[PDB]
Symmetry: C3
Subunit: 217 residues, 3 copies
Amino acid sequence: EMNFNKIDLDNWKRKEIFNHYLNQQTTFSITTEIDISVLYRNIKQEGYKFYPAFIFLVTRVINSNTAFRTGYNSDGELGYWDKLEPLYTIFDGVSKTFSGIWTPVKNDFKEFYDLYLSDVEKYNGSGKLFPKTPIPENAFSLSIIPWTSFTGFNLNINNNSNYLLPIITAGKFINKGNSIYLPLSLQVHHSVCDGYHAGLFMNSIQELSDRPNDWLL
Amino acid sequence: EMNFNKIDLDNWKRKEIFNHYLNQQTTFSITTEIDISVLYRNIKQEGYKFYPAFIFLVTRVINSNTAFRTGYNSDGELGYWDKLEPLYTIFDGVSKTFSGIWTPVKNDFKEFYDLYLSDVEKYNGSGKLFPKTPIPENAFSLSIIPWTSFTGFNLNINNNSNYLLPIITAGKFINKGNSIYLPLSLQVHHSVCDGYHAGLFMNSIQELSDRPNDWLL
Amino acid sequence: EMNFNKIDLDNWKRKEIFNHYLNQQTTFSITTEIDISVLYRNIKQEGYKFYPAFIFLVTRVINSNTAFRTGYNSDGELGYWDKLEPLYTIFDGVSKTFSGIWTPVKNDFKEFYDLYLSDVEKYNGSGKLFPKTPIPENAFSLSIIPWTSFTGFNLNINNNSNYLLPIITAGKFINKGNSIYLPLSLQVHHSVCDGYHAGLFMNSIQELSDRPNDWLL
Ligand SMILES: [Co+2]
């Protein structure tokens, strides 16, 4: 069970802004395009499938800043987890449905990649939305829409809750000559993520994509 | 009165996902740009006005998959209609206001075009938001914003309801040399439309735009 | 205290549409890219900082149409103010936090610029979200996200209120050769702003950006 660090709200420099946007129930989506040219050429050179490389990359960025890992646990306690695991989309080409499964990211990419591969074989095609349960509490949602690109994406979730963890959505590649771009939307809760943290997320994605030798190979 | 096919929720493969996103009240907007170069050149060659051609095109895509036609009727019953009619924007240049009217799409484009033309003459300039009533229940909203282009568009409708039908918004053309692009935002309810269906919508719009000889002429 | 013009709802041509979207609680965000090449070259030639020039520009557009200045005052009365003041983001590079402060725009740019400069010196680095209080009621929010560009941005504010004033968010410049583009998202309430008014806003921003000699110099 992942370590959960309970937050002392009265002794948090964010107390005012946290409570402000909690009462306003304020999240924002920010959509851009990541240049994945270097990343894609490297995964192709290695014969790695792109999706798990991208899942691993996103998870690394999530685990680089506690603002991306702050939420309420199942007992309603505010805190942040040491690391999150990705809850990511998989597709059943037959039944024409998708599922969400999770795979731990403990260390290096190859270790994750092998577990991703076996998890997809085990849990795809089940007819269940969540065939791999229980889902760990320290999880973030990573969705992909491989059938169309986009320049804007927003989720309207009017569910009476203040869910504080980041929500990530990626789209179909856009090719411009020798460049390959990945539509990417980040949706975060302003109680824990400011514009600054959104910029940190996208810039970190881009910087890691351009340095695959540092974490992939 | 359009035929409404009542859905047997207990015998629907989507039951789990439908109820999941109904409870979460989850919709999403996805914005992209359609290449309308071929479509526009063809409507210009024929001397057809672009807007009704586009209304007809969108309606054809809506009527190509039941996931785009699923909702609650006025008695609160879940089902899907055999076909939807467009409820589309018209503008009064004088009073500087807009209205929403609907025109049935029964068969071929020319038949629709003539009814569109007479409906616009009859119902524009009324000072009423909805001058043509009653509006049929089997209708979807198609809005246009011809004064500015956009790369993202989202409606925040916090209205206590689970409205399940697609919502479409188009923007001002973007010219890039010999290419013409149409900003297009699709906003759908995840209980009935997944990322897959959103991709199906945008790819169908693009494919039909590039083959106007197949449905327009 | 800014003059507030109370609206006679029963004698407003917008009564129907206003009440319609108030009950639906409908706002929309529309994101585009402004070509700021001319504006940026001019502020650079003068040695003016870009941000206050942009704040002044946005405020001029806000103060050009009453649809951008309509809201409820603190006594719950519907009306529109003669002018709004910007409530804009400032950043503390140390503590790594932001604040919102407001500076009146009474006349010419230089007058505003000098007050902006002194307000930033006085009120930055305070540790308070709103260090300059009371905030005037005739204020609109202008946020900047200078760390990343974007092509879509939406705020999901599920706060039980019908806040009717415009919300503006700008992103990091995008350079394309000799052109400089500014990501810009406008989020408005459909009770008081239609697609038309959104187009008026973006087109006015663009037109003023391209004619800085008219308001800046
Ligand atoms: Co929303």
